[PDB]
Amino acid sequence: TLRVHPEAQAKVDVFREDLCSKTENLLGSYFPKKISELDAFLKEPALNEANLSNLKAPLDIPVPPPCGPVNCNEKIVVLLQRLKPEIKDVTEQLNLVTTWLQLQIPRIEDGNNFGVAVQEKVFELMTNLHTKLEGFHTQISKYFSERGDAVAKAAKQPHVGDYRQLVHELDEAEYQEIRLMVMEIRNAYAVLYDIILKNFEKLKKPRG
Amino acid sequence: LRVHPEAQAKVDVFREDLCSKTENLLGSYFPKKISELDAFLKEPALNEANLSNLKAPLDIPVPDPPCGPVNCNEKIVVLLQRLKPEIKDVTEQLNLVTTWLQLQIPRIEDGNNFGVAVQEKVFELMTNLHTKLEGFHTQISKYFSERGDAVAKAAKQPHVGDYRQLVHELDEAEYQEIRLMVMEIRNAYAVLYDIILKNFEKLKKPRG
Amino acid sequence: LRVHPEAQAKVDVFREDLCSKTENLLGSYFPKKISELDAFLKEPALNEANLSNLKAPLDIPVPDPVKPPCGPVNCNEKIVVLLQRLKPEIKDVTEQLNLVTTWLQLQIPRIEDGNNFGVAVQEKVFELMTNLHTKLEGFHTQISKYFSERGDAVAKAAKQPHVGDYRQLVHELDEAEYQEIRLMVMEIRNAYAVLYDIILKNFEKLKKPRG
Amino acid sequence: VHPEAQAKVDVFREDLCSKTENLLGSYFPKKISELDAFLKEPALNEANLSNLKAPLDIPVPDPVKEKEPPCGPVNCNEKIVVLLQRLKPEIKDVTEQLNLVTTWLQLQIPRIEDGNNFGVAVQEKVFELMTNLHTKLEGFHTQISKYFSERGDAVAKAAKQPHVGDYRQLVHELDEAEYQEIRLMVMEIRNAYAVLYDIILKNFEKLKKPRGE
Amino acid sequence: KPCGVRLSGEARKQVDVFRQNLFQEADDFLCTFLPRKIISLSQLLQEDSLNVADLSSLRAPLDIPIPDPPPKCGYLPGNEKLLALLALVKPEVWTLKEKCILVITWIQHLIPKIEDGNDFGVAIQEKVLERVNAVKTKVEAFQTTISKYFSERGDAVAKASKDTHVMDYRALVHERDEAAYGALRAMVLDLRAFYAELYHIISSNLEKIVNPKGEE
Amino acid sequence: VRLSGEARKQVDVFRQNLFQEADDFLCTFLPRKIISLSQLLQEDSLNVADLSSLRAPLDIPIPDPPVPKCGYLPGNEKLLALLALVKPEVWTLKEKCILVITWIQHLIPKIEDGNDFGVAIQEKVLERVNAVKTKVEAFQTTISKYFSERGDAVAKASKDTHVMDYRALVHERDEAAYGALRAMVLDLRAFYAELYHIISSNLEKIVNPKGE
Amino acid sequence: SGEARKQVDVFRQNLFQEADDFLCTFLPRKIISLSQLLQEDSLNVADLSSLRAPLDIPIPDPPVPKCGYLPGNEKLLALLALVKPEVWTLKEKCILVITWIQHLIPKIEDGNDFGVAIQEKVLERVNAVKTKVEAFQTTISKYFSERGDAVAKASKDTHVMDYRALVHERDEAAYGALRAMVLDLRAFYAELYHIISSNLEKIVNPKGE
User: Fold this and answer.
1) In chain F, what residues touch C7 (CB-CB under 8 Å)?
2) Which cysteine-cysteine pairs are annotated as disulfide bonds in the entry (chain A)?
3) B62–G69 CB contact, under 8 Å
4) Which of B167, B196, B152 is nearest to B56 (CA)?
């Protein structure tokens, strides 16, 4: 009574073949294209600030309370405009390829499990990248949360000079993080492209 | 899988650039940074004979049975201006070398995995350095956050003598920590230089 | 320093009470509870067609800037009556699970070098009882968490009438609690079924691991 | 070879070994007797727990006489404080002698070799017990600061909100719990001396000489 | 004394009513329900609400008055676009958690008497049961993300209104929206993936899950 | 490392007291605890059929839709009565777990190579007694947390009168505490039975692991 | 590369010399000075009631005065000034020994790996000492913040006498902790020498030549 139904199997195989052809397009087109964009983006003068005093935004608070509008750091905001969709795309294609590799895992058997071990080793990297790239997503929300608290304390306590310095250091630290986050996203594409293309036969055909 | 000539060329532009960067770093940059940081350690800025030199002014009125501007510690700030770019460089070159080593990991094969074990052993040390060096970035932001709160609490409650001491203890601890960070960054360059050049045969070509 | 049979007799009285009670749980109580909870799942209290039925009244005054104290915000009626039925069900499973766990622990024989397959069977069935105990204790604490979180959401909504998300938060906690209560009843029924199944299957080795 | 460094560390180890023999031969039996005598005293054997209930004078208000906050000094629990004055120097002594014996055993660990490591396994087994005692006894040290912190917060809440009767109960429950904990902390300290004495004296051959001279 | 349970016909029938419904519901899950979810979730991903090109278009108007360098705030509603999307995603999250519980309880009943030898079928059952629980854990993580959105945005909105001078709290409210959308889209992809993965691992190992010992 | 005559006696006074107290635990004390805890479970305070009877009157003024000061809010006397019965039983079992742990640790012989399965049995029995002690310590944290959590719930309810969920929370903490306190006494009886069963079954190897 | 090769050889010759100077002369002198430090009367306080600083917060009568300046514990501030440098110096030398041993780890080759296994175990213990030394720094920094909060609560809530007891108990705990640090610091120097000197042949010369 309970068995594999060709009608259900056909509907799942439509998704399975669709997911495979997309993965081949990522290796064949999307991943090499992204490496060129991020290499080009790294060489731009936005991410290569010569002097760190350029990033210092106006923190107009009266020295010793009513306070005027303390704006966001303009140079960091326009970097986050480009970074956010790059974080979106890399997590999108990582999730797609992680799903593809899961559907290539064959029946659990007593032996002939080398190709299965190859899949597990490549899946180990995809899990580690997923942990790293989720960390990038949350830290941007944390930046505005921490800067807002530093600005709030600086306005309420004008006499305390460290709260003023904290806002500038959070800006400097965020700029330095965005540099590395762009590098890490490019490295993720390059390493994913590298590891899958080398092991593709054992990933696709784990038992021939 | 079917090959792609234009796609491969875009990744090879990055891969050739990444390989040429690593030869430059082992050849010149890493010995150069060891000499700079050794010279920096011997200067009088990181060899304060008496810790009372680091004690900043804390002009808050003492009550007896609404204050002036409390500035940042000048001697610690100027050390952080020199430290921050040294943290930027060591993390970037570590991230570059880590990516280089991942792309040298060959196809997963059933035997002849001693060279793979050498790569994994050297990769283990780079991951441990990456964990250590990432702690330093938030540490600088944490100093101004903790000092700001100590000065804020000292100003709100001038009668509590311990909050005044706390601000000076954070300064003494920060100087001592900054001193150790410069050594740890120098040792990171030295150990990376040492371990890679020793095992460079099996890192570059794990199966001969 | 040696075993005294006066003390041995008093533990064996407690031991045989657990045996006889475990017989009644498998033979009568567990099949009955599966039927009650199956009957409870099919009622219209746990089959709300539209989730807007669960939306409680939250009469907090929205301020007009051009032109604070609040009225008594009552609990969600439909969720409270479900919790009044759910709470005694949670109490029963944890009490009977504890009884069968205590029964199985006292069936563990002397520690020996070999002949430990029956001991491994007991450990395998005990693994399930530990995992169920962790799950069902989670259900116990989440009901207290619901009233705590809803109270804090209502308190923030009254304290901050201009923030529309705190009003929404209260309605979302109600929807989530209904959906959780529905699953907690299913999880409780499945606990009775899986306990009944695994104990009956392995009853000879659980009772007599070395013959 | 480093002769200056090998000399003074051997002088440190010989002095540390001399104190360890004094601990087993004299100090550890002495402490077990003191703590056994302390456990039998009437300070740690309260027949009725209502004896530990301290005065908690906060004005209990009602709304009818209100229609017709400030508070007096809420003192520490006297019977618990005097027990802590005796317990604190006892905790101080165990942690010091445990540290001393642990440092002695660490310096008895020989060269790392490929075999002949049964005596090394004996040292590691006895060291495990010393590590678990160190974790337990450090827990006692921080718990006393935790008691005064938790009681202060309960009294502060009880004073600021006198209408909440459970905060008044919370202060008395913290007192009852602390007395009961102090009672067990003395037992655990006595057992630490006894088990250390027992395990070291039995295995003294292989701890002293793991590879047999 | 001997411990011996002999089951009355009443009690055995009561459990047979449950077990026949469980095994029938598990069959209909794999046969029809699960393929239908892969089609409907795929159709949901082609909607314009889930294919937003620029995440800044999701930005709702905050309407808090900006101070000036030397008026109390009005009503601040939630993000309508995310509230519409949350109404589509929430039911899909709750249904898969229910079907994970079904498949766990179903496989639990297929685990036979523990006998020494012929245990590889039992090992396969455990390994599939592990992966189904892993899917359930990730589905429980989606519920915590959805509940945390409403509390976090409300606190961010409250900070922005209470401290009007701080413009980073206004950016935080809008960053909470973009992160919530990105999470909710990633959920629907993961939900479709989990249905596909649950079928693939069960269908591939179906003979050993159902008949671990090799009975005819 | 030679020991004096007094030094050996001082320890022998403790050791032979410890062995006697541990023997009295298993023979007389532990079976009596199974009888008394069984008799305690038959009491009316622990067999409350409807948990609505535990509901204490929370006398806080209900506000009207757009103030009276809050009177004295006492604790739940039914739970305070039940806590007085449970608390001593929790503290006593923690004391006896320490006795059994110290008793078995003294029975662990000199570490010798070979004939070590008796020592392995001792270690596994010691593990289970520590596992019981950890669960008994978890009961103490549950009891101490009840007093603080109810005080905060009553304080929130009195502060925020309009929020009726805080009133439900106070009553829910009472029902949860009751169910926990009943579950404790069942567990305490089970732990006495389990402690005897594991020690009595393996008593030859616990006392004489080497088989001398 | 000849210029750049010389730059590293200056560092490596400095590291091996500084590591040798640590084991020969520095470490034994630290055991003498820490032993000599442990003989002092500031570290052997007979009754801890002598360390009790005066709180001087006005005790309110039963049913308002300003609070005067409340200074820190000057006995502990003197002791903290002695312990702090000893903590920072050992963390300095742990980093030296870790970097010294890491440079002695040879090229990874199959076979004759027991010498490399000994180097890893010594490194593992030196890192374990560093983690305990880092725990002392967190204890020292936490004392100043915790006492300040305890004194602030005691001054704000004058009626609560347990906050006054907490301030004096924080001092006694800090004193007992600071004494235990100095004992541990001496022990770590002795332990670091013993493990390195016993295994020095295999640490320096792991492959056997």
Assistant:
1) 26-28, 30-31, 196, 200
2) none
3) yes
4) B167
Write a three-state SS string for chain B. Answer: CCCCHHHHHHHHHHHHHHHHHHHHHHHHHHHHHHHHHHHHHHCHHHCCCCHHHHCCCCCCCCCCCCCCCECCCHHHHHHHHHHHHHHHHHHHHHHHHHHHHHHCCCCCCCCCCHHHHHHHHHHHHHHHHHHHHHHHHHHHHHHHHHHHHHHHHHHHCCCECHHHHHHHHHHHHHHHHHHHHHHHHHHHHHHHHHHHHHCHHHHHCCCC
What gap in Å lies between CA C26 and CA C29, rounded to an integer?
6
The answer to whether F202 and F125 have CB atoms below 8 angstroms apart is yes
Task: Count the domains in chain B.
Answer: 1
Experimental technique, in short, is: X-ray
Q: Which residue of D has its CA nearest to F156?
A: D164
For residue G170, what are the domain limits? 1-209
Nearest to E94, CA basis, from E151, E146, E159: E146
DSSP chain D: --HHHHHHHHHHHHHHHHHHHHIIIIIHHHHHHHHHHHHTSTTS--S-GGGG----------HHHHH------B---HHHHHHHHHHHHHHHHHHHHHHHHHHHHHHT-----SS--HHHHHHHHHHHHHHHHHHHHHHHHHHHHHHHHHHHHHHHHHHH-TTBHHHHHHHHHHHHHHHHHHHHHHHHHHHHHHHHHHHHHHTHHHHH-TT--
- Say whether B183 and G70 touch across the interface (CB within 8 A): no
DSSP character at residue F73: B
Backbone dihedral angles phi then psi of residue A70, each to the nearest 5 degrees: -90, 105
Contact A204, A118 (CB under 8 A): no
The per-residue DSSP string of E196-210 comes to HHHHHHHHHTHHHHH
Backbone angles phi, psi at E76, to 5 degrees: -120, 100
Task: Report DSSP state, residue F27.
Answer: I
Domain count, chain G: 1
Q: Chain C partners of E8 at a C-beta cutoff of 8 Å?
A: 27-28
Q: Name, in order, each residue with C-beta under 8 angstroms of F21's C-beta and a sequence gap of 6 or more.
A: F99
CA dist list (Å): G49 to C21, D19, D81: 61, 28, 13
Cβ-Cβ contacts under 8 Å for F99 (sequence gap 6 or more): F18, F21, F22, F25
Of C124, A8, A105, C195, which Cα lies nearest the Cα of E131?
Answer: A105
Q: What is the total residue count of chain F?
A: 212
Backbone angles phi, psi at F48, to 5 degrees: -80, 115
Bridge partners of G160, per DSSP, are D74
**In this structure, what token pair is assigned to residue D57?**
């004078």
The two tokens of residue F23 are 């023997």
Dihedral, CA atoms, A188, A191, A196, A197, nearest 10 degrees? 130
- Nearest Cα to Cα of residue G207 among G121, G117, G122, G99: G117
* Nearest by CB: F109 against D161, D188, D202: D202
User: Domain span at residue A20?
Assistant: 1-208
Q: What is the distance between the alpha carbons of residues C197 and C208, in angstroms, rounded to a whole number?
A: 18
In 10 A of CB D52, how many CB atoms? 17
Cα separation, A89 vs A93, in Å, equals: 6
Integer Cα distance of B121 and G180 in angstroms? 37
Specify the amino acid at residue E209: I
Whether C160 and E158 lie within 8 Å, measured CB to CB: yes
CB E85 within 8 A of CB E114: no
Whether the Cβ atoms of residue B165 and residue A190 lie closer than 8 Å to each other: no
Q: Note whether B80 contacts G: Cβ–Cβ < 8 A.
A: no
Decide if G30 contacts B57 (C-beta within 8 A). no
In this complex, the chains that touch C, judged by 3 or more CB pairs closer than 8 A, are E, F
**In D183-202, which positions are buried (b, 16+ CB within 10 angstroms) versus exposed (e)?**
bebbbbbbbbbbbbbbbbbb
Q: Does F148 reach chain D within 8 Å, measured CB to CB?
A: yes
In whole angstroms, give the CA distance from residue D9 to residue G31.
8
Spatial distance between the Cα atoms of E140 and F9, rounded to a whole number of angstroms: 62
